[PDB]
Amino acid sequence: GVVNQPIDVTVTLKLGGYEPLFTMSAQQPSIVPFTPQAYEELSQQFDPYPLAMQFISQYSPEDIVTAQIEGSSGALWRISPPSRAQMKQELYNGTADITLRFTWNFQRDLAKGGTVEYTNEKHTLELAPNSTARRQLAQLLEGRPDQSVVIPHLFPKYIRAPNGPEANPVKQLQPDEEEDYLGVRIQLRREQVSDFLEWWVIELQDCKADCNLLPMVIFSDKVSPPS
């Protein structure tokens, strides 16, 4: 088989039908293949768990990458003034759930082999009305720069990029599913020029050394040569 490494990893964070808060596309050299050191460290992390190790042993270091996703959105927030107001009101006053969606889409090079260029999926959370996170997110719109909100269980760190179009978080490494996804801290950045440019910034809640990066670990099944 042939290594089938993503050449683009694109992720988004979107609240309801509002203009997406955060978009980012990682490409070379932000897509970092595992070294034997990385593979050893991953193996040490999951050593106590035979199920996890059985999954990991199916992959060579070359089959695994860390997408070092920049947490500052790649684009200015596009939202119109009335929709920004509607979003604030819905967050605060809405009586229905509001969906928060984190998407990922991995592009592959078909010239190497394989048949399915993109493989993707998403994780969604329903933010209940009047919930603390929902009110805190709404509060960020007031533009106090020191403020933030943590959304628990939003970022699936370990994802498989198989030959087919559906890229699921790896259950063997995240056996409690959503409960094993990482918390994400969200902030709104503003620069004075509707008299402010706005963009959103996310980081892993427990980030330490490189809070600007959200490292997504992607296991790619090998592919057959082209035909």
From Swiss-Prot:
Residues 1-227 are extracellular. Disulfide bonds join C207-C211. It is found in: Endoplasmic reticulum membrane; Endoplasmic reticulum-Golgi intermediate compartment membrane; Cell membrane; Cell projection, Lamellipodium membrane. Signal peptide: none annotated. Expressed in bladder, colon, kidney and skin. Also expressed in bone marrow, liver, lung, spleen and erythrocytes (at protein level). Expressed in myoblasts (at protein level). Expressed in red blood cells. Expressed in cochlear inner and outer hair cells (IHCs and OHCs) and vestibular organ HCs. It comes from the Eukaryota. Disruption phenotype: Embryo lethality at midgestation with defects in vascular remodeling. Conditional knockout mice in inner ear hair cells show no auditory and vestibular defects. Piezo comes from the Greek 'piesi' meaning pressure. Homotrimer; the homotrimer forms a propeller-shaped Piezo channel with a cation-ion conducting pore. Heterotrimeric interaction may occur between PIEZO1 and PIEZO2. Interacts with PKD2. Interacts with STOMl3. Interacts with TMC1, TMC2, PCDG15 and CIB2; the interaction may be part of the MET complex. Interacts with MDFIC (via C-terminus); the interaction prolongs Piezo channel inactivation. Interacts with MDFI (via C-terminus); the interaction prolongs Piezo channel inactivation. Belongs to the PIEZO (TC 1.A.75) family. Pore-forming subunit of the mechanosensitive non-specific cation Piezo channel required for rapidly adapting mechanically activated (MA) currents and has a key role in sensing touch and tactile pain. Piezo channels are homotrimeric three-blade propeller-shaped structures that utilize a cap-motion and plug-and-latch mechanism to gate their ion-conducting pathways. Generates currents characterized by a linear current-voltage relationship that are sensitive to ruthenium red and gadolinium. Conductance to monovalent alkali ions is highest for K(+), intermediate for Na(+) and lowest for Li(+). This is Piezo-type mechanosensitive ion channel component 1.
